[PDB]
């Protein structure tokens, strides 16, 4: 039996799926700890920029979880992604430990822009700026990639890099009450929010686990971007990003929530 995680329902993905929008033909790169082979995922390709982990398989669990929020297959098992038909690429930029070097992250973005990815999911971030990272974000953006990044989990009124950068779409986390999750970073540069508490998704060992974080929020938005891209094949990264913000549900202060809660039903109308 397949279940629909609360976050998926919250952003109204099923509403879009019922119009025939599933992210078909949209390439989405997950820059994380890898993506493990799993019955509820369809992994098309990828690369590893982590020396010592040549494989794209996930030794952490984070990348697998993020991947399932975007594209867990619509079938009779497991869960359901926001864009269950999206073409998923495992881009390993973090090791099993869940940490990585900036250069691996920049190489992953370069890779995304060189392989014609439409969306890059970066559920990672640092409080410090990086010239190398910035340049990578900007290069992937002028290559047509929509870069989506987590705002950070420190609960402070400033957001992490790369989410803070103008060309990155910064995502914060909401709870079941449509309030900002206590850990969700907010402030200047925040674009939008999505569910980030108790998020059930795919996990290594062919199972399912529930996590919390802005890392869980991010994929909801990467998935919503694929739905819009499928509907509007001619739109650029920028047009998609503005549309998502334009159709978000206002939740209160823009300092805390940016545009509001992503809404895939409204964005695919
Ligand atoms: Ca499934
Ligand atoms: Ca931003």
- Per-residue three-class SS string for 157-191: CCCCECCCCCCEEEEEEECCCCCECCCCCCCCCEE
> How far is 49 from 36, CA to CA, in rounded Å?
16
> How far is 177 from 231, CA to CA, in rounded Å?
30
The one catalytic residue in 62, 118, 220, 243 is: 62
Q: What is the resolution of this structure in A?
A: 1.6
The strand pairing partners of 193, in sequence order, are: 172, 261
208: its two tokens: 């399912």
> How far is 171 from 123, CA to CA, in rounded Å?
9
Annotated binding residue at 40? yes
Find the helix or strand (DSSP H, E) in which 202 lies: strand 199-203
What dihedral do alpha carbons 230, 119, 214, 36 form, nearest 10°? 100
C-beta neighbour count of 45 within 10 angstroms: 13
159: its two tokens: 């957001």
Spacing of C-alpha 69 from chain mean position: 8
Quickly tell me which residue has 């990086």 as its tokens.
130
- In three-state form (DSSP H/G/I as H, E/B as E, the rest C), the secondary structure along 94-127 is CCCCCCCCHHHHHHHHHHHHHCCCCEEEECCCEC
Ligand 2 centroid distance, CA of 185 (Å):
12
The one catalytic residue in 48, 123, 215, 259 is: 215
215 is catalytic: yes
The one catalytic residue in 17, 32, 85, 160 is: 32
Tell me if residue 20 falls in helix, strand or coil.
coil
Ligand 2 centroid distance, CA of 148 (Å):
9
Ligand 1 centroid distance, CA of 78 (Å):
4
The strand pairing partners of 80, in sequence order, are: none
Residues 151/125, Cβ–Cβ less than 8 Å: yes
Annotated binding residue at 168? yes
Q: Which fold has domain 1-269?
A: Rossmann fold (3.40.50)
Quickly tell me which residue has 């619509």 as its tokens.
74
DSSP characters for 35-101? Answer: ----TT--EEEEEE--TT--S-S-SSSHHHHHHHHHH--SSSSS---SSTT-EEEEEE-S-TTS---
Provide CB contacts within 8 A for 55, sequence distance 6+: 34, 48, 92
For residue 173, which of 215, 138, 217, 204 has the smallest C-alpha distance? 217
Provide CB contacts within 8 A for 265, sequence distance 6+: 12, 15, 16
185: its two tokens: 């970073």
Ligand lying closest to the C-alpha of residue 162: 2
32 is catalytic: yes
Indicate the pairing of strand 43-48 with strand 87-92: parallel
262: its two tokens: 């992503």
116 CB burial (10 A radius; 0-12, 13-18, 19+): exposed
Method: X-ray
Find the helix or strand (DSSP H, E) in which 251 lies: none
Spacing of C-alpha 1 from chain mean position: 25
Ligand lying closest to the C-alpha of residue 167: 2
- Which residue numbers come right before each break in the chain (C to N over 2.5 Å)? none
The residue count for the chain: 269
162 cis-preceded (ω within 30 degrees of 0)? yes
Ligand lying closest to the C-alpha of residue 187: 2
Ligand 2 centroid distance, CA of 168 (Å):
5
Q: Give me Rg for the CA atoms of the chain.
A: 16
Q: Where are the domains of the chain?
A: 1-269
What dihedral do alpha carbons 264, 265, 267, 269 form, nearest 10°? 150
Dihedral sign, Cα of residue 220, residue 9, residue 262, residue 200: negative
> How far is 32 from 56, CA to CA, in rounded Å?
10
Annotated binding residue at 165? yes
For residue 168, which of 203, 133, 201, 197 has the smallest C-alpha distance? 133
80: its two tokens: 């359901």
Residues 211/65, Cβ–Cβ less than 8 Å: yes
> How far is 85 from 83, CA to CA, in rounded Å?
6
Tell me if residue 253 falls in helix, strand or coil.
coil
The strand pairing partners of 249, in sequence order, are: 261
Ligand 1 centroid distance, CA of 39 (Å):
8
């Amino acid at each position: 039996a397949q279940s629909v995680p609360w976050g998926i329902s919250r952003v109204q993905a099923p509403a879009a799926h019922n119009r025939g929008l599933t992210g078909s033909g949209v390439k989405v790169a997950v820059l994380d700890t890898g993506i493990s082979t799993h019955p509820d995922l369809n992994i098309r390709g990828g690369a590893s920029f982590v020396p010592g982990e040549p494989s794209t398989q996930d030794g952490n669990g984070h990348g697998t979880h993020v991947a399932g929020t975007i594209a867990a297959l619509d079938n009779s098992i497991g869960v359901l992604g926001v864009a269950p038909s999206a073409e998923l690429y495992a881009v390993k930029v973090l090791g099993a430990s869940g940490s990585g070097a900036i250069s691996s992250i920049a190489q992953g973005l370069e890779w995304a822009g060189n392989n014609g990815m439409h969306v890059a999911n970066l559920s990672l971030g640092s409080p410090s700026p990086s010239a190398t990272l910035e340049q990578a974000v900007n290069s992937a953006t002028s290559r047509g990639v929509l870069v989506v990044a987590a705002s950070g989990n420190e609960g402070a009124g400033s957001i992490d890099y790369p989410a803070r950068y103008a060309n990155a779409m910064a995502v914060g986390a909401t709870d079941q009450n449509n309030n900002r999750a206590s850990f969700s970073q907010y402030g200047a540069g925040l674009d939008i929010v999505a569910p980030g508490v108790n998020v059930q998704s795919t996990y290594p060992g062919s199972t399912y686990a529930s996590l919390n974080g802005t890392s869980m929020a991010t994929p909801h938005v990467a998935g919503a971007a694929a739905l819009v891209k499928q509907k509007n094949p001619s739109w650029s990264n920028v047009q998609i990003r503005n549309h998502l913000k334009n159709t978000a549900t206002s939740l209160g202060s823009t300092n805390l929530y940016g545009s509001g809660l992503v809404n895939a039903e409204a964005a695919t109308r």
